Design a protein around this ligand. Structure first.
Ligand SMILES: O=C(c1ccc(-n2nnc3cccnc32)cc1)N(c1ncccc1Cl)[C@@H]1CCCNC1
Ligand SMILES: [Mg+2]
Ligand SMILES: [Mg+2]
Ligand SMILES: [Zn+2]
Lengths: 153, 52, 61, 50, 39, 84
RNA sequence: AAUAGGGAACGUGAGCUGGGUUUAGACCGUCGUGAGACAGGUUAGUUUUACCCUACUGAUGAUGUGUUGUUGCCAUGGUA
RNA sequence: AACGAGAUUCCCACUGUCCCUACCUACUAUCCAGCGAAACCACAGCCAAGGGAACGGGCUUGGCGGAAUCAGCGGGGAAAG
RNA sequence: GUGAACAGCCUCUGGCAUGUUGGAACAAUGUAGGUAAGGGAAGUCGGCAAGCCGGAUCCGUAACUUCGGGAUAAGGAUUG
RNA sequence: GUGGAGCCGCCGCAGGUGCAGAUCUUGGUGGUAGUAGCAAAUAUUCAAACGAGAACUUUGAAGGCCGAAGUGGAGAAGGG
RNA sequence: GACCUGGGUAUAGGGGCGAAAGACUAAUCGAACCAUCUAGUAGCUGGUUCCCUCCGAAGUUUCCCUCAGGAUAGCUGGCG
RNA sequence: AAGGCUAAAUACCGGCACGAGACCGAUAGUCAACAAGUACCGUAAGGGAAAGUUGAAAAGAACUUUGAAGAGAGAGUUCA
């Protein structure tokens, strides 16, 4: 398919993709800000400590009602949350971002995450049950992702 | 459209519940449950002065 | 490896309730094999599903 | 009911056979556009009325 | 099978809880708070 | 008790499915039918519901013996065998 | 010591309470042929939602000073 | 007389109704993990006086004003239904 | 089993995972359950709420009365 | 720049001929918002297995609950 | 005990039924629901889609079961 | 007059076939261009939708890698 901003160093920069993966959008977007521009083997070591609640992920845009925590002072912010499902999937395919990279003959120990974006998926539906005999929808909000991994030289 | 465009049987809500006083269809069930009935405004409705 | 079928089939051939049946978890891939009723009666004869008798309700006091 | 007359269980035999998935090859055929059976009556969702 | 749950069933239904979700909300004069305003 | 706890006493059916029309309308207490009026001789159709004719006119069934009239008529009801 | 008078959408119902008024039940009196009427009387009578912004009360904070910490001064604002 | 989930007054005993509040437990609320709606919505949201459709948030003239926020809160939005 | 008892409480036979989820901490505010010295309705439209008495035995019983009732009246004493 | 098979000017003729509103109609999507919420009926815990993966499955051992007007064993009606 | 309850049957819209509240009659009752006559009538609210250029007012008379409206004149425009 | 018959010119929005249209072009046209009086609701009378388009051709992505799979990366098909 076609990405956004196909790479300027096209032989020596790798790329991956995942579509219609059931995570929240507002928790997959805001774990993607926190690793944007980070070296991969530190970013892989980052997302493990998110799920083990050692090193949080700050919420900068979608900060409605999010309770404070102390680990967010590293990122200059007061609110944080530890997504152990959202930082699972894009841990699970930074595995599959570099599994393509050395398949193209690239030294993976110099990769940094250049580009990453999250964009929503068609919201699949099921229904709730409310008062006075009314129905409202439980709408899941899944999301696509997209990423470019670039060696620095 | 000669005369028939009115083979959908309906009535107005008749009270200020929170919708317009346009005729709404009856029943339940299908997606044509409380939609707009005849009148020139509405989807699936009659036309203004249907030609003769 | 479900054993819910053996839990049901034993408590109609031992004439007992579903609770009281069954000790011995060591031959688990042996008692999961037999899903019949005639092949489940060998496991009583081999002593792998036992009766495990009734809880005590002494009328001493 | 389990006390049913004959003209019910030869009606229930008809609403049990026609509640069935499609064979897969007819989706491949020429000149159709159907891709899933939509008349599948699910026994808790949608009920018959006798 | 392989594609009997993943390519037969994924078109079968997948919009069947949207049997509208409601028929209108016929809640029938919920101004039960009798108010009567000073007469 | 007027509402949802009254629906729990809905247990015995009233309209079983009829024998001629086949429409779930055979009223069992009164031994008649809704759409066709079964113990009557004539078929209950009316003009006030102009669609209910359209559900059950000639042409909405199979027309098993008027696929045979509307084809034999256009040759004039021949009765002989054929020529070889 | 004094038991001063007042206002703030007749301060104050997503603060409460329902006693009276002011629905539908009912009784008496007077008026009316009658249905019913009665600032005449009595008894019985469902009180909805704050998660939005603001105000406020608390709580991390933010900028500017090179990073950072300790000890401090006080413009102001409150007031017994 | 009896009887009454009937209505009213007093007395005895009693008590947190109160003087005057305090403490303890459970389930919440709170925070994290996962799933995640609706109500409502011109644009939005600091105040005083003035005039004005005679009681503004937005105009006039003044007083003044910092990001993004959480737990509450029931004065206002002549709030919402 | 206890007890007059198919009352409540507990256990075996026979069932299930606490009712469409858990982990951590134990603020306000509620929700449900309690206790409180001294006073005892002063609260409030109102003794509403909560409390008090509650089973058995032996005593003991008034006004009134249609002579059946009031009545388990009230007021006590005992209870392992 | 996409697009892949039809279109426009001029003289005349004919219109279901032009949208910001109608608590418009159908359809779509936010803001609220990762917020409210997942709180009626006491309660789970340890090891092993199958497994890519276990607070929620199975199996055990223990702790419990319903407690014979049952959270048990069976039917009518209804469900098919 | 003027007691409670299952199934069968009867009574149908100006009609059923009522130990009487205008309750009940499929969440609908001071007259049920479904379809048509019917797109029922409305002196009454809500709306009524392109641009420029020229001219540009009226709330008064008389009469009306007229006072939220219409007729008549007045005032306006277009055509000569 | 108190008995009777009768083709033609004439009416047709149901029926079998047809032909044409200064029409409508998928929220239009009938409700229905498709498995529409179908899915669905209502005890019943009855109410009743949504939904047309790959390409010229299926030539519908063989094969290799990662992951349990969804899904990616290469390769390929096609002018695309
Ligand atoms: O449930 C309700 C109830 C309460 C409010 C609404 N309202 N009011 N405005 C509304 C706008 C939208 C939606 N609902 C609305 C509806 C119902 N009750 C109730 N309470 C008091 C009076 C009348 C009732 Cl019916 C029951 C009755 C018995 C006690 N338990 C609760
Ligand atoms: Mg100072
Ligand atoms: Mg469309
Ligand atoms: Zn019939």
């Amino acid at each position: 398919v076609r990405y956004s901003l196909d790479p300027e160093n096209p032989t020596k920069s790798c790329k991956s993709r995942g579509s219609n993966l059931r995570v929240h959008f507002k928790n997959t977007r805001e774990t993607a800000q926190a690793i944007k521009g980070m070296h991969i083997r530190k970013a892989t070591k980052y997302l493990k400590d998110v799920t083990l609640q050692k090193q949080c992920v700050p919420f900068r845009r979608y900060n409605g009602g999010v309770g404070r925590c102390a680990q967010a002072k590293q990122w200059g912010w007061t609110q944080g949350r530890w997504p152990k499902k959202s930082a699972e999937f894009l841990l699970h395919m930074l595995k599959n971002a570099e599994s393509n990279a050395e398949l193209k003959g690239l030294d993976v120990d110099s990769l940094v995450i250049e580009h990453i974006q999250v964009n929503k998926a068609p919201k699949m539906r099921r229904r709730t049950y409310r008062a006075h005999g009314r129905i409202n929808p439980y709408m899941s909000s899944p999301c696509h992702i997209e990423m470019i991994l670039t060696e620095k030289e | 459209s000669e005369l028939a465009g009115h083979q959908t049987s309906a009535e107005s809500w008749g009270t200020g519940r929170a919708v317009a006083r346009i005729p709404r269809v009856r029943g339940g069930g299908t997606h044509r449950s409380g939609q707009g009935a005849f009148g020139n405004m509405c989807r699936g409705g009659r036309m203004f002065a249907p030609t003769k | 490896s479900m054993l819910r079928l053996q839990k049901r089939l034993a408590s109609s051939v031992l004439r007992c309730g579903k609770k009281k049946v069954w000790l011995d978890p060591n031959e688990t891939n042996e008692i999961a094999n037999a899903n019949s009723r005639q092949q489940i009666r060998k496991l009583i004869k081999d002593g792998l599903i036992i009766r495990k008798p009734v809880t005590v309700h002494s009328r001493a006091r | 009911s389990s006390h049913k007359t004959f003209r019910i269980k030869r009606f229930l035999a008809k609403k049990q056979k026609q509640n069935r998935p499609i064979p897969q090859w007819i989706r491949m055929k020429t000149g159709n556009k159907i891709r899933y059976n939509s008349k599948r009556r699910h026994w808790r969702r949608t009920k018959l009325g006798l | 099978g392989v594609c009997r749950k993943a390519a037969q069933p994924v078109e079968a239904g997948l919009q069947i809880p949207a049997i509208l979700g409601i028929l209108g909300g016929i809640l029938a004069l919920l101004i039960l708070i009798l108010l009567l305003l000073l007469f | 008790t007027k509402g949802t706890s009254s629906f729990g006493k809905r247990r015995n059916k009233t309209h079983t499915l009829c024998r001629r029309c086949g429409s779930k309308a055979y009223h069992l207490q009164k031994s008649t039918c809704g759409k066709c009026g079964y113990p009557a001789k004539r078929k209950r159709k009316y003009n006030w519901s102009a669609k209910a004719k359209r559900r059950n006119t000639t042409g909405t069934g199979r027309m098993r013996h008027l696929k045979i009239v509307y084809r034999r008529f256009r040759h004039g009801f021949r009765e002989g065998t054929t020529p070889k």
